[PDB]
From Swiss-Prot:
The modification Phosphoserine is found at residue 78. It is found in: Cytoplasm; Mitochondrion membrane; Mitochondrion outer membrane. A motif (BH3) lies at residues 87-100. The modification N-acetylmethionine is found at residue 1. Intact BH3 motif is required by BIK, BID, BAK, BAD and BAX for their pro-apoptotic activity and for their interaction with anti-apoptotic members of the Bcl-2 family. Apoptotic members of the Bcl-2 family. This is BH3-interacting domain death agonist. One of its GO terms (cellular component) is mitochondrial outer membrane. Residues 58-69 have a biased composition (Polar residues). Pfam families: BID. It comes from Mus musculus. It comes from the Eukaryota. Keywords: Acetylation, Apoptosis, Cytoplasm, Membrane, Mitochondrion, Mitochondrion outer membrane, Phosphoprotein, Ubl conjugation. Induces caspases and apoptosis. Counters the protective effect of BCL2. The record marks 59-60, 75-76, 98-99 as: Cleavage.
Length: 195
């Protein structure tokens, strides 16, 4: 009797990557305060950002003589940076995914690893382990690639409310696949495209 082996770490890491984690929540997932907890990460240097806030103001009034004819609401869409958008869109996809996340046991597999606060001796390998799995079932480019990604958010989606003790891990899970994969499938696609 004798048998035991397992190891392998490294590869990945990206600025935009982490953005997916912190960005994901920023879009959806747990809550704002969450993105802060999970998002709250000190890289190799001295991270730090900012972004002016917004506000609003209602109105009342009483005294008013018959005189009015219009009740249309405002509508203006203008947001810079699309890449980042995809980051946050990730989480948003997680929630939406809940709609149908298991057309054959997709999120099921990825969810397989999503167990214990440390599986396969490494709280993060399990997830990435799904990427390979999710693909093992639903492999492909944008289809699979995007499929596996759905997994990352799956953990958080569930974990976020399933594993409230793995908050930090929750985020890592999301930026796990992307981090282990090509950040944004679109990013790579962009590179591939155009001479």
């Amino acid at each position: 009797m004798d048998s035991e082996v397992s190891n392998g770490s490294g590869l990945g890491a990206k600025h935009i990557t982490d953005l997916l984690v912190f960005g994901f929540l920023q879009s959806s997932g747990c809550t704002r305060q969450e993105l802060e907890v999970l998002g709250r990460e000190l890289p190799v240097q001295a991270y730090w950002e900012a972004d002016l806030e917004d506000e609003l103001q209602t109105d009342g009034s009483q005294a008013s003589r018959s005189f009015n004819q219009g009740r249309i609401e405002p509508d203006s869409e203008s947001q810079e940076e699309i890449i980042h958008n995809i980051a946050r869109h990730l989480a948003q996809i997680g929630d939406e995914m809940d709609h149908n996340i298991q057309p054959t046991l997709v999120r099921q597999l990825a969810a397989q690893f999503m167990n214990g606060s440390l599986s396969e001796e490494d709280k993060r390998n399990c997830l990435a382990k799904a990427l390979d799995e999710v693909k093992t079932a639903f492999p492909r480019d944008m289809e699979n690639d995007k499929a596996m990604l759905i997994m990352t958010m799956l953990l958080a989606k569930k974990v976020a409310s399933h594993a409230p003790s793995l908050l930090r891990d929750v985020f890592h899970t999301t930026v796990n696949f992307i981090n282990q994969n090509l950040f944004s499938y679109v990013r790579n696609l962009v590179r591939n495209e155009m001479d």
